[PDB]
Design a protein around this ligand. Structure first.
Ligand SMILES: *[C@@H]1O[C@H](CO)[C@@H](O[C@@H]2O[C@H](CO)[C@@H](O)[C@H](O)[C@H]2NC(C)=O)[C@H](O)[C@H]1NC(C)=O
Ligand SMILES: *[C@@H]1O[C@H](CO)[C@@H](O[C@@H]2O[C@H](CO)[C@@H](O)[C@H](O)[C@H]2NC(C)=O)[C@H](O)[C@H]1NC(C)=O
Ligand SMILES: Nc1ncnc2[nH]cnc12
Ligand SMILES: Nc1ncnc2[nH]cnc12
Lengths: 540, 540
């Protein structure tokens, strides 16, 4: 017949084919390859988004990486010897605007490390799932955990209450706890512990949080900027027309004086030229591209949008350039010039630190990671099994036990490599729809991730306005869970709304979850007391 | 029979009873009285929320009512004569933090005007609807337009692009345009101009916008404050631990110098004591009270939460007091002492100004007022028409023609009195469910508004944390429309998501409408272009 059919039958009748149960699942080798290719195309936006998001966290970079700066900007620090001229020792404010060049270079190195870490974590998770669980599921650092880890647990450039190393330890212990509870069967009980409206609306809240991130400046396309009165207004003015803010002291006359040691923001206040930034409009074009490719059921929509925006931003002397005419931009372009590079993780791998265990914020982050991972994986795996028709009458799909252990072990491995918790993407369904039934789909995705490595220079040059629209569209897709909330019932609507609005507004998944659970408990206190009195017999 | 039955038969058979068609609609006098009482209780929260929101707009007064202040705060301006001592002439910054005592005396006076304007607009609108349309519908300044008018069109203390007087002309002309198109039958044609996903998700977007306002400081309970890195984090620290912000100029050193003339914010940045403000926790208790009363189907749920929080805030020497131990607090308490007062509108009535017609921002507000009023009234009026069973096979309910002109005429009257556009409340369904069928229900509601006056001192003493939870809980109810969006269709989900998320984030109803309509048009260009070619014949 055809060489393709010969390869298919040879693989299916081989030892590997029987090990992967290719014949028993009605697909042998080319269907698995196509399913893996489709899954990788649909999920490969993570290679950009996760790396950029976790890089905004600052990584292991600290004040010790900040170089001393001269008294005047016109003199390079080596020539900073003269009358009235001195070297300014860096403090905590070196991490934030204006960012110390040494810290920025360290953050770029951390970005390369995090690209490699994302690739390696996705590869290892896919290999573990394909081999030990034998399911067509691809694993990679999850988006919700990505944003929560970067901008809430650690904060922008380590401005949060938990350091990057302590957050890595939190992710590691979270993965260990998830593996422990999965190995016994308490995972379903801890999943049912979360109230149904809160559990359903957590996905929509995380989507709103991701879209809000995609609508910021250092994070996405802009269009949302600081407002003195409303706190938030229309951004997307050019970067030349953005100014910083610092805390001040008011009085009864108006002597607004600067607060010494205040944490100056980035460039978030637009003075003029609203809706005129070319980077925002390039992001909008990428958003339109991804939206049309999603409408047309085109696999790799976010890939195409990110690639288009990044390629437009790769030109050197434009207003949308990813390599500005600065020392940092020159270094970024120099690294981008070498298309291929085998980058070795230097600062991020094995950067765990268990020093902050006794702190409450560490355990808040750990519990939020654990609940997000449990709910996400429980929903996703069973949705996949219903997609692949692996669900029996009992509601199980055979390899679920090893699937959950694979997810937890991949979380632990990714924490060791220095990334936010990794989980099974819903994009895996794209492979299942293509005919993927065995673990060879996961192995194909892992090989594609391997080929994604060696392109770290090509991936480290992706600007914020390219990260941008993928975040908003991920929010759009995650917003579909709102239809499962009984909005007519206030005991269901109010907790769901509280979660859904507190995740983007408080800008924290943990705070949204806490508020939703608290509101649910408070609103059901009356009903629970009534049923308790009835059970005791005081009421009929 | 009983004495009550005698009243029902006498009124029903009288000239008034036949004029109102009490017999023909199977309810004569007491049912209308209970329906009017039920509608008013479910709606009376607007007596508190509307005036408080529109007061933050700054009202009709300018810097011209800011008093000159002495150079040092320790000397009253009359004694500001000495060496190195001078009177500081007020500038634009007198309106904002720190607020000039002269301008703070406006908002207290303006709030009293807006309380009467809220009642008089509600009273006149109900009477017009009850008499000319003969429907059990109550009219009041609509929550959809209050916040947009105050915080977006005019801005906080007149910081927006349109003055309060010019915004009143926008409402006045909006009422005239709405009356004209309704009178000629083109209202339905303009209603279908807005795309379906944008029209449905605009209600959810305004609810998120209102709930966000309920989570601010000058607007609601707090819990959302400024963040140097994320622009929003967890507020609800005590007012003593909140600090202002001013724009600064960064460099390559760190010499952040204050930007002269910068617009200093309020007190939005928490330094310490997060989740410790008693006023936020008092608001949370009021949130729980309304939430349970909403769960238990208790009419007037939002009154009880507002009244409870306001009553606790009426004590003089607490941390949740509405009358702080200041000159403004003493004056506010002094007015609160007289329980009854017949306040006469002095600054707000007849404060129209057509000077800003040529400006683009005037027409952006005018069109947004028109579409919000058109979509709200069309959706709201036909909503109760099913409740009262007035809809025939053709889809109209007899008095619909005068129902829309009653709404439009009341908008013109409300603008003359100086309030945000008034509309038919969905809370009118409460009286209809109680049996209200004629215009006597609206007249009964209008009479309750007469009693709402003579209590302006009792209503002007309502703190921000009392407005608070009603704003959040209104957003919960308006959130139920998301279930009508086809979230699986990206051509419907993306425009709906953009409409829904831009209203709180850009903090503007107009921007959410523009972005959602713009994204809808772009996402349908391929479909419209393909269909257009088929009509031309180039494609099959
Ligand atoms: C406004 O009031 C303050 C005191 O509340 C005046 O005092 C100044 O305060 C700042 C810092 O608090 C000092 O740097 C100044 O040296 C103080 N000046 C004096 C004369 O004491 C301040 O002068 C007042 N500002 C204006 C413009 O009048
Ligand atoms: C860093 O460089 C800036 C100038 O670019 C210095 O700014 C000082 O403060 C204001 C703003 O320019 C000027 O009036 C001063 O003349 C500036 N000083 C000098 C010597 O020019 C700033 O001094 C530098 N940062 C530090 C800590 O010295
Ligand atoms: N956290 C997550 N869970 C499932 N699928 C995802 N795709 C991207 N992030 C994901
Ligand atoms: N704008 C509005 N439309 C209908 N009902 C409302 N209730 C409060 N505000 C309303």
């Amino acid at each position: 017949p055809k060489l393709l059919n010969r390869l298919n039958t040879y693989v299916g009748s081989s030892r590997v084919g029987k090990r992967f149960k290719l014949a028993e699942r009605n697909s042998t080798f080319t269907t698995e390859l196509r399913a893996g290719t489709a899954t990788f195309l649909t999920m490969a936006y993570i290679l950009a988004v996760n790396a950029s998001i976790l890089s905004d966290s600052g990584g292991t970079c600290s004040v010790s990486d900040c170089i001393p700066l001269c008294s005047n900007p016109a003199i390079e620090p080596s020539q900073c010897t003269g009358p009235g001229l001195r070297l300014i020792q860096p403090d905590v404010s070196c991490k934030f605007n204006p960012v110390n060049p040494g810290y920025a270079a360290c953050v770029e190195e951390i970005r390369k490390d995090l690209i490699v870490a994302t690739v390696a974590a996705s590869l290892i998770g896919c290999v573990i799932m394909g081999l030990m669980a034998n399911l067509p599921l691809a694993l990679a650092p999850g988006m919700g955990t990505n944003a929560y880890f970067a901008y809430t647990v650690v904060g922008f450039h380590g401005s949060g209450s938990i350091s990057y190393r302590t957050a890595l330890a939190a992710v590691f212990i979270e993965g260990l706890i998830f593996l422990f509870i999965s190995a016994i069967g308490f995972r379903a009980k801890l999943a049912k512990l979360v109230p149904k409206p809160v559990r359903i609306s957590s996905s929509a809240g995380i989507g709103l949080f991701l879209a809000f991130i995609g609508l910021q400046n250092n994070q996405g396309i802009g269009l949302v900027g600081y407002s003195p009165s409303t706190l938030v207004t229309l951004a997307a003015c050019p970067a030349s027309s953005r100014i910083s803010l610092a805390p001040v002291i008011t009085s009864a006359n108006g002597t607004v004086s600067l607060l010494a040691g205040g944490s100056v923001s980035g460039d978030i206040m637009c003075i003029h030229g609203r809706m005129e930034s070319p980077t925002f409009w390039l992001g909008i074009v990428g958003f339109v591209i991804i939206a049309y490719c999603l409408v047309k059921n085109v696999k790799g929509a976010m890939i195409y949008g990110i690639v288009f925006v990044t390629a437009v931003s790769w030109f050197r002397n434009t207003e949308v350039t990813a390599f500005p005419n600065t020392s940092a931009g020159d270094a970024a372009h120099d690294y981008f010039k070498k298309i291929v590079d085998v980058h070795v993780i230097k600062h991020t791998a094995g950067a765990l630190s268990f020093s902050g265990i006794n702190k409450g914020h560490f355990w808040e982050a750990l519990v939020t990671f654990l609940y997000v991972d449990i709910l996400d994986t429980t929903g996703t795996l069973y949705s996949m099994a219903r997609f692949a028709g692996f669900v029996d009458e009992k509601g199980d799909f055979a390899g679920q036990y090893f699937a959950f252990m694979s997810d937890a072990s991949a979380i632990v491995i990714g924490s060791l490599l220095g990334t936010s918790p990794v989980t099974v993407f819903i994009e895996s369904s794209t492979g299942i729809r293509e005919g993927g039934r065995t673990g060879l789909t996961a192995i194909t995705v892992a090989v594609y991730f391997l080929l994604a490595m060696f392109f770290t220079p090509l991936l480290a040059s992706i600007p914020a306005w390219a990260v941008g629209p993928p975040l908003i569209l991920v929010g759009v897709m995650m917003m579909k869970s709102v239809t499962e909330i009984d909005w007519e019932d206030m005991r269901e609507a109010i907790p769901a709304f509280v979660t859904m609005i507190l995740m983007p507004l408080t800008y924290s998944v943990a705070y949204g979850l806490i508020g939703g659970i608290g509101s649910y408990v408070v609103l059901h206190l009356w009903d629970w007391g009534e049923e308790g009195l009835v059970k005791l017999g005081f009421l009929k």
